[PDB]
């Protein structure tokens, strides 16, 4: 697994550990989506929400998928590609999650659902890319959704990942 895959895994671990020492709320106050327009120029917040996890099974399950799919994008399409997928999906899934239910949310599953959508579409339309998602997993992904949690994140991420894959799958 490449550098981008790894950097993100260490960022999420580092942040998780801080949340255990300082407590969730303390880290949330600084890394969450702006709760107050006054804070709108604290630019990190549109990304840093993705780095916070709230339970062990939350971090594990997300980093799992991220290691699997992230690594495959980074291996097959390079580090720049995965950066862009990450940044766009984090920001957009954040934007929509905030609208649904306000700013108190976190987790990499926005990014994860974008990656899920990207790998699957791109593998259907462009088998040349060398990436694909088994239909067994696209069914598990769809079960996660209907079981929903940042619902706005999941669905906004997915959208983003399909869009980018389509764009990339013509060229």
């Amino acid at each position: 697994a490449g550098p981008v895959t790894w950097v993100m895994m260490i960022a999420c671990v580092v942040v998780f550990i801080a949340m255990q020492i300082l407590g969730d709320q303390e880290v949330m106050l600084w890394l969450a989506w702006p709760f107050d327009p006054t804070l709108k120029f604290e630019f990190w917040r549109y990304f840093t929400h993705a780095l916070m996890h709230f339970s062990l099974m939350h971090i594990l399950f997300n980093l799992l998928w991220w290691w699997y799919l992230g690594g495959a994008v980074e291996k097959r399409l390079g580090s720049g590609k995965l950066i862009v997928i990450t940044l766009i999906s984090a920001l957009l899934s954040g934007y929509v999650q905030q609208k649904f239910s306000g700013p108190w949310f976190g987790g990499l599953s926005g990014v994860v659902f974008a990656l899920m959508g990207y790998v699957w579409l791109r593998g259907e339309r462009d088998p040349q890319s060398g990436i694909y998602l088994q239909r067994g997993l696209i069914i598990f992904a769809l079960i996660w959704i209907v079981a929903g949690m940042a619902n706005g994140a999941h669905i906004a991420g997915l959208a983003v990942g399909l869009a980018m894959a389509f764009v990339d799958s013509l060229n």
């Binding site: 993705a50 709230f54 939350h58 108190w104 949310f105 976190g106 987790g107 940042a150």
Partner: peptide
């Protein structure tokens, strides 16, 4: 808090 919601999980994403």
């Amino acid at each position: 808090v919601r999980m994403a």
